[PDB]
Amino acid sequence: RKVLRDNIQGITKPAIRRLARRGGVKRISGLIYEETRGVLKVFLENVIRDAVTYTEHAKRKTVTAMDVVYALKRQGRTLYGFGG
Amino acid sequence: GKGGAKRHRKVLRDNIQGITKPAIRRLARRGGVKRISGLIYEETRGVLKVFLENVIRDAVTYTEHAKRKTVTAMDVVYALKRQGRTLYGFGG
Amino acid sequence: PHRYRPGTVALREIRRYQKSTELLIRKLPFQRLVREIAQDFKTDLRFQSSAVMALQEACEAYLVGLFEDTNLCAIHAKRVTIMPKDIQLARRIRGERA
């Protein structure tokens, strides 16, 4: 597979602004976008590490939503609608 | 009886007021607080009060299950565990 | 030329995005980031569409809740504009950092 990279910038400035507006934020500073990108990224490797270890425990090469529910539940961030 | 039945009967202190505000100051010093507002203590009282019904009730709710009315260290430590504040040293 | 005062459109879109519930981050940049960092953890992995949707929804919820925490921490300092130390404090209170 192609070794893709540098798509953390894909979380665009208007997207982060919209997420902040949904959270009740009225004014946003410039570096907020990239630093919240970093926080999002950190949450991402944590959650995918848990989900991928779950999947590898099942001898599977495809990550399913059910292991995602497992990871979210075990991180105290239980998600509904995707099984479990 | 007679004599000695009047030993420190100054009960005119509220139950929540027994937290002994200097103890709150000591806890703040342990918490790294340099300056404390004057009316903070009492609300922390209430705050700690809340924590008590957050914790002990759970342990209290354990007590009747074992057909007992004496709260044990195991009930307390498991009440802390179920609330996310597990404690060490009282599991024996 | 008609121009609204600063904050009016921001507050209008605040109600707009607090009224709707659709996914707010567009899909495939998140998909590509997940693929890259998962390959960094383990190569040759595959992902279900429902799995990526679950990741997207969970991350949106986590960031939006961080955003109410952010607004509370910012207004705590008599401010209406958010700066990184706000969410740093919010996470250190949450226990995410220290």
Added chain:
Amino acid sequence: KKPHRYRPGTVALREIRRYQKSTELLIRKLPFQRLVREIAQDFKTDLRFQSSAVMALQEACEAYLVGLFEDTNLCAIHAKRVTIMPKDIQLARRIRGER
């Protein structure tokens, strides 16, 4: 002739160091057994308390308060202040999610 007086903060910092280097309990005992007794009989009348259970409750309460107090100090210093304020403790409890 003007008896010696430390400036505000030096004794505060000394107490900070003293209570951060020590491990003894800071909440007085007898009021704590009282508080737990009345709050327990508020839920079930005529309860009995073990010494170990009371010690565990006291240690847990002191730990919860002290940690909330670093949280409150962080909230206060975030607002360019040094004195803890009720808005600081409310913000800390709101972020923790207990509220």
Added chain:
Amino acid sequence: AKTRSSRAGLQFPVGRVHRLLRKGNYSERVGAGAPVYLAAVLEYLTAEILELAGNAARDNKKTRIIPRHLQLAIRNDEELNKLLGRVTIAQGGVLPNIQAVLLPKK
């Protein structure tokens, strides 16, 4: 020819939930009334949350319950909010809430 679910006057299947309890590896043995109590609790919780979701949908001029209605029901009930404080509802969104300070300061 009476099912134990109908015998207890409940809608949820007592047999299935008892089988799940046995398969859940909770202990060596499971009592007879435990699945009945469990089914009653589950049906009460779902009835309350569905009633609140239907009320929210009616408030939105909607007759079909959507995840937004479920989120509105769960968040506007402080007890149910305490039940689901650490759980995210898919496609649920957030409650409309703007601080007074965020409002114009004219």
Added chain:
Amino acid sequence: AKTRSSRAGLQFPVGRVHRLLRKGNYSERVGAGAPVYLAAVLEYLTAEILELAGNAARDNKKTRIIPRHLQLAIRNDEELNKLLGRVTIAQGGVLPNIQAVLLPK
């Protein structure tokens, strides 16, 4: 002849761990190596936690481990810090830590 702990070169009792697994209702069947690996993991964690406790004690001019040394050991290692980050320690106190603004001048 030889204990399962001795056969695995472990001080912790493998048989006791297996019995606890059986009575813990985690699974109706338990693998042979699961109690051995549990004993090894708990032995490992005990090894570094007691090592850091002894280091704290010798830095504190003390030869007996006390809960204060235990908290000093557990908190000073950030991984070990998060292991007991949501855990309340008895008779340990707090770490010496003062904010920059609190310091004079």
Added chain:
Amino acid sequence: KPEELRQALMPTLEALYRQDPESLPFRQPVDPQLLGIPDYFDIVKNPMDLSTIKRKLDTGQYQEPWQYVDDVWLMFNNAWLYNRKTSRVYKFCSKLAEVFEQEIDPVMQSLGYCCGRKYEFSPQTLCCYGKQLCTIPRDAAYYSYQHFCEKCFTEKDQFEKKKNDTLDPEPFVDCKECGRKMHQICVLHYDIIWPSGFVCDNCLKKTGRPRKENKFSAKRLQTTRLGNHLEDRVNKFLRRQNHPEAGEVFVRVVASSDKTVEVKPGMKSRFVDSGEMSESFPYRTKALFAFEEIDGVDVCFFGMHVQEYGSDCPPPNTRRVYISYLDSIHFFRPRCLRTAVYHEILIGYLEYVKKLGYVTGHIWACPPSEGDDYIFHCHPPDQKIPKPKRLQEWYKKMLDKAFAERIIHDYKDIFKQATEDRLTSAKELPYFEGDFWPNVLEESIKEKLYATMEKHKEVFFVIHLHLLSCDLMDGRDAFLTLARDKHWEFSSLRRSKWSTLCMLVELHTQGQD
């Protein structure tokens, strides 16, 4: 005269006043209205306080100080009774009373009286009559008329219900000349010994002739070869020690008879019906006691009983001795030789029977249960009850010391002895009266024997060595019953002296020879 009584009694009362804050509640009469205790007069019928004592002494209302002592103890008892033990007044009264014992004796000893203590006997336990075998429990509801247990009458309302808590006061004697009240125990006066009445030493000092010699002493008791040997050995050991506090010790056998032990019905059916062993085993029982000269009077400090089966006794009891009961009093002087004296008694017995031809000895080393008196009634409260291991070590030390003198050939436990003898049946076990083993065998027959031997291995000791008619001392039950009825206690030195005097008089005058 009031002046002498006042100049005597002010020091102790003032010392009582000195105690603070213990004596503060006793400065004034108890006022129910002021103290808010309207029920004070319902419990305390005759209250008095320190001010009442002062005003009564100042007006000279005492003609002898025992009324002072009785009033002080009565107000002490009132304070203890009305107030709970955990209250202020109870412990205040306890401290004041302790000061009272610490101060009263030197003052009253100079006024011409024996002592200044108010003495109350132990609660006298009663005995049942319907069953003729049970007794009346102490500190419990009891039935009596004109005495029955709680379960006796149950298998009509004229009975009286009460709880056994009453106490018996010490007897008092009045001097025929002075008339001063005296404690009978303290003065050691007894009517049969002195038919002329009680005369204080002060009056006899105005006469010249002292108290006449007491013929009812342990010295004049009938002597026996065994008792003579024991007393000679003890006296020789004491002379070798030459302790200044040690006195002459008299060992006398006061009872000896021939009895038979009957096989119990279970073992009677299992072993006697077949005819392999006889229905009963004859033996000789003897009782001996040790008396020491303390403070010019005899004090009994040792008692022990043996059962002796001679050469004509059928096996397995042939040529054996068994120690049935053993008792002692720790008031021997000096204490450091007390234990060393006891050995010289029992070892002296072990040698003596060895001279007579006996081969085997048996010892049942079982510590007494709390409240159970072996021979002497009312053991002192401060007398240490040895642990079973301590008693076994004491007996082992005795056997080792006797072995060192080449008197004892060997000593083992019953389990090791049975294993070495290759015993295969319970019938080979020695048969003794009231022994634990016959009861164990009866229980086993009613419902592993070697396991029972091993459990009680350290308790029983087996030793390889190679008529006076007295109904009172024919067994430990009669003497204990008489002591309980007559309050013959051994709980203190003076009480032990009085009890020894009484038992010596009983043996001297009520004997059958």
Added chain:
Amino acid sequence: RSRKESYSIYVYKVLKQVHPDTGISSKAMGIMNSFVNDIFERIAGEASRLAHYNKRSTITSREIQTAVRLLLPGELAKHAVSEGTKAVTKYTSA
């Protein structure tokens, strides 16, 4: 294909009981199934822990009721306890 059980029909019956003319979407059904499964797992695990704590090897009504009291706060807890007592009484009365 492997059977995958769900509580869709029971939730539908309950919502007909409480709202005869109200429908639900498939995603709403998934959310509801996830919620009921999660609360089931939570209270069942709490009951199992309570049984383990008192050396009890069976889940009966008393300990599961206690677990529901622990997790459900206030009015919901009282309603659950009352309805459970009623349901177990009805079950044992036939």
Added chain:
Amino acid sequence: KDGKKRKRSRKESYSIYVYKVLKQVHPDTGISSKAMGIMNSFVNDIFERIAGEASRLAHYNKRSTITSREIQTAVRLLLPGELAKHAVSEGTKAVTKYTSA
């Protein structure tokens, strides 16, 4: 003596094993009773945590037996890189020694 009054409350504890581990890691260091209780509680709650993770890993994948792979993955979930690798290495060494025993 049936119904002995001394004691019949055998309390499960890992005290001697923790003391031994202290001996290997620090032969000349003491230990307090309170610290020993802290150690017992820590090893205990770690035991229930890891056992629960292994149990859920077995249950979710329709696996009725808890084997070595289950605890491998459970340790990988609970522990980040350094502690996880060291614990995995020592556990693998222990199980290999047991197998070859």
Added chain:
DNA sequence: CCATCAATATCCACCTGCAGATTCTACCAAAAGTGTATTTGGAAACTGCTCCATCAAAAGGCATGTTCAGCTGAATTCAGCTGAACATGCCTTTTGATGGAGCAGTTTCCAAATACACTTTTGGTAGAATCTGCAGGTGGATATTGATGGC
């Protein structure tokens, strides 16, 4: 500043096309439930042993009032940060189709886990007696910080 007014986002009623919600026909294997057989968690009664509430004195602290240096917020001013607007265009988002890596159902069967049954060791517990880490207690003494003072 209070009043009208123009530009603009919002609410909302209405109507059309359709993916999705709801209704039957038939199927069908997975449970559910009844009725014996067997086993056992625990209700229930009696009782010895803990330890918990109650109460005492000895003591290490706590509760008020005073003085004031320093904390915090109101008031003020200003650089420039980002919100509002707009132009350009990036890439999106769906609709479509496709090769195949990979998930999972079905069959076989064996090394591994289990249930006893027996023998072995062994950590708990209790009591005796030895060892010691350290909690304070006592003599300096030491930055250290507030204060007096000189530049």
Added chain:
DNA sequence: GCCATCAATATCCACCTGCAGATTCTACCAAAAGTGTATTTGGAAACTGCTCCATCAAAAGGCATGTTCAGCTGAATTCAGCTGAACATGCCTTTTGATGGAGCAGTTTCCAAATACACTTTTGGTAGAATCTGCAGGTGGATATTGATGG
């Protein structure tokens, strides 16, 4: 405004010494713990049916990206009312030790209550086709909302 330094203080350490607490040694034994044997079984491999996971085409409009102006918001500065910090004063409340019995636990009985399993019946998914239906989405205009226009 800086700072070099007499002077009271809590504290680090140099030392110590007695004791509650930790450490060492002997002994008993039920409870595990290890080994043996027949039994059962969960999952390894082997092959394959099959669902969706990954991959390439295309286009055009929804926002993504870049630029500009300034509204006002964040940031810096003064200062004054004042709330708390430090401290001396008085006393009281807390801490530690001793002592009855209310219940925490150990023993025994036995029965209502729990599994094991062989059928039989009901029942919950669910392939498949048909009809019903709530709201996605576009239209149009009356309706608040905002900002600064005449004066």
